[PDB]
Symmetry: C3
Subunit: 269 residues, 3 copies
Amino acid sequence: MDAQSAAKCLTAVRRHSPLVHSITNNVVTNFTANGLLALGASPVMAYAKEEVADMAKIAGALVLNIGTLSKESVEAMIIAGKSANEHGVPVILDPVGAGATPFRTESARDIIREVRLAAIRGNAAEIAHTVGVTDWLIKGVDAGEGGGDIIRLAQQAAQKLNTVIAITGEVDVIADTSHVYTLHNGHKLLTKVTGAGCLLTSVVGAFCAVEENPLFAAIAAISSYGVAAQLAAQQTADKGPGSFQIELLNKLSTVTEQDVQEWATIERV
Amino acid sequence: MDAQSAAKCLTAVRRHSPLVHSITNNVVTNFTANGLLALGASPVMAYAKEEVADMAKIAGALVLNIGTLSKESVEAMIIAGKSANEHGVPVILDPVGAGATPFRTESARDIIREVRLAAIRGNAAEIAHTVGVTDWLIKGVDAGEGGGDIIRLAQQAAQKLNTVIAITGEVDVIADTSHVYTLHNGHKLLTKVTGAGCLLTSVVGAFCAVEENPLFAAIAAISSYGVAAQLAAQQTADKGPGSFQIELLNKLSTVTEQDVQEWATIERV
Amino acid sequence: MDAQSAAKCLTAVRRHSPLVHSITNNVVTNFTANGLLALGASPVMAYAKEEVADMAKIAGALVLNIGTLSKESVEAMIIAGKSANEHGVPVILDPVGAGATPFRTESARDIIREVRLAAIRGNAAEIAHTVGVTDWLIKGVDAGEGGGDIIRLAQQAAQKLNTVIAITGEVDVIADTSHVYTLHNGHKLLTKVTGAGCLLTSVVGAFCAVEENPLFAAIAAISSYGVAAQLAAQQTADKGPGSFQIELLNKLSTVTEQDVQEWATIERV
Ligand SMILES: Cc1ncsc1CCO
Ligand SMILES: Cc1ncsc1CCO
Ligand SMILES: Cc1ncsc1CCO
C-alpha cells in the first residue's frame, strides 16, 4: 500500500460512517467517542453481559480495551467477541497494561485464546507479554534501541496468531504473516493527551469495517490519524496540550485526501 | 408559551442554581456535569443502591439515562425514582437505545411501570418502543418523512402516560395530554459532540426544578439550549467539532434573555 | 516554606514524572488524567480488587476519591491503601460528599481507620464529618464566616490523625500536628469546571511523590495549581468556562518557577 491508497480508505470511512462498538476503559470513553464522531464514524458503547452479543452482531467492528478492566468486563468482551466471530464482524484488541500486573497479562491471554482477532495494537512490552515472546522494549528515547528486533517481534507474533500486529512507537511497525511495514507519522504531543493511543485503536476499527484486508486498513488508519495529529500540532504547538486536544478533533474532521498523500510516510520492509 | 416566557425561565434557573441528580452513562458524565455548571446549575452523580434514595430526596430534579446500563444500575434508577416520587422531585427519563436490543427495551418499560415521570425525551423510534406504539422514524434526512405522524405519536404517548413527551429531531415536537408544539432551533454540529442530546435532557431537568408546569419547562429548556448551540456554531463553524464543543459550553454561560427572544422559534399546533 | 521553595518542588515533579495511581469517580477520570499529563506526571487508573494491590506497590503515590463510590470500590481503596502502606507509598484521600449521605460518611470513616494517610483534602463540612469534629462551614460567601474557627478545625483534625489536613476555600488552610498556614491563590472559574478540586488532590499526590515532608508538598502543590489557574483566567476571563478548562491544561504545562514566585501567597500562622 502507499499514501495514495491510504487516502482513498479515508474517504470510504466518511461515506459509510461505520458503527464501531467499544468495550473500553472509563478514562477514555468520551474522547474515543468524540474522535470517532469527528472522523465521520458512529460510536456505540455497551458493556452489560445481557446485551453485548446483540450489539456486537449489528456493528461494523468491535474494539476491546482492558485499560480499567474488571472480572465481569473481561467476561463480557469474550461473549461479544464470540458473537462478532459468528457474524463476520472484525474484532480489534488493545491489551493496555499487559505485563504491568498478572491480572492484566492473564486477561489478555484469555481473550486471544477465545476470540479470533483481525488485529492487536500496543507497545512492544504489551505485545510480548500477551503473545508470550522475546524482544523487550517500552518505547525508546533516541539513537536506536533496536529496529530489526522490533520488526522481528511483530512478524513472529503475527505468524503465530495469524493476525495483524501493530506495534506503535516513534516509528510504527505493522505486519501480517508475510508482510512488514514501518510508518513515520504523528507528533509527540499525542503523549500528553490521555486516550490518544486508545482513539487510534478505535480508528483502526473504523477502517477495518470498510476495507477487507486488515493490514491495509491498519496502515491507512494509522497514517491518516498521524497526519491529522501533525497538522494539529503545527497550529497548536506553543499554546499547550489543552489546545492540541481540541485541534486534534478539528483536524480529524477536516483532514483531506491530499493531506494524507503529502505527509504520510509508508515503507515496505 | 412564547420566546419571551422561555427567556424568563432561563434567568430563574441561574438565580436558584438547582441541584440536578444524574444516574447516567459513563460516556457523557463529564460533559453533562460541565454543561450544567456552565448553564448555572449544580450537578451531582451518585449510582450506589445504598445512597441513591438519600441523594434523590434532597435534589431539585432526578435524571435517568440508560446509555450504558447494567442490571444493578437499572435497579438503582428505580429505587431513586420511587424516592423522588415520595418527596415531590420531578423525574426525567432518556431511554437511550430503546429498541436497539431487547435488554434496553425491557429496562425502559420497567422504569415507566414503576416510576411516575414528569417527562421523557428521545428520538421517534426510542419513544415508540418504550411506550409500545406506532409510527416509526429515526431522525429523517430531507423533504419530509412525516410531520403529522410524529405529532400523533407524541400526543398518543403523552395521553397514555399522562406525562410530557419531547421527540427531538431537526424539528422538535413536544406535547402533554392536551397541547402540542413544534420547535425550530439548534445546529447540526450537535450531532458531532457525544452527549449533546443527553446534556439537553439534563437541562430539561434543571428547568423543571424551577417551573411547575413540565410542558413549559421543557419548551424553555430546549429553546435556550438550541439558541446557545446556534450562536456557538456561528463562532465555531469552519474550525471544527472540537472548537464547537468548547464554544457550546461558553455560550451556555453567556447566552442572554434577549438572545432567546430573538432566535428561538416556538409554534403551538 | 515560601514561594521560592514551592517553585523548586514544581521543577522536581517535572524532572521525575511520578506515577500517580488513582481510584476515583467516573465524572473526573479523563480531566484528572489530562491534568496530570499536562503538569508533567504519569497517571494510572485501576480499580479491580485483583490488581489494585499490585499497581499501588509500584506507584509513587496513591489517590483515593469517593465521588461516585460503590460497595466494591471502597473495598478496593482499602486493599490498595494497605499495600501502599506496606511499601512506603504516600496515600491521599478526598472524602467527596462526606456528610451528604450516611453511606459516604461511613465509607470515609472506614478508610481512615484502616489506612494511614499522608494527607486529606476537602471542604470544611467534609473534613468535620470524616474526622467527627466541630466547626461547620461549606465554603462561605463574603465578609467572614470565621477564619480562626477553620484554622482550629484543621489543627484539631491534623493532631488527632497525625496527618496533613488541607481545607480548601477562597482562602486555603493547611496544617499538620504543629504548623498552620493560609494560602491565597486561584480563581473562581475553578468552580465552573467539574473535577477541578479533584485534579488538585491528584496534583498534591504528584508533589508528595517527590517531597518527603507532606506539609511542604501540599503547600507547593496548591500554590502552583492556583497560579496556573489565575494565569489561565487572565487569558480566559470573558470567553467562558469552556475556554478556561482548556487554558488551565495549557498553563499547567507552561507555568514557570518565576510565575509561582511572583503570584503565590503563602503565610505562616
Ligand atoms: C456513544 C454512546 N454509547 C452509549 S451512550 C453513548 C453516548 C450518547 O448517548
Ligand atoms: C458532579 C460530581 N458528582 C459526583 S463526583 C462529581 C465530580 C466533582 O467531585
Ligand atoms: C491513564 C489510564 N489508566 C488506565 S487506562 C488509562 C488511559 C490510557 O490508556
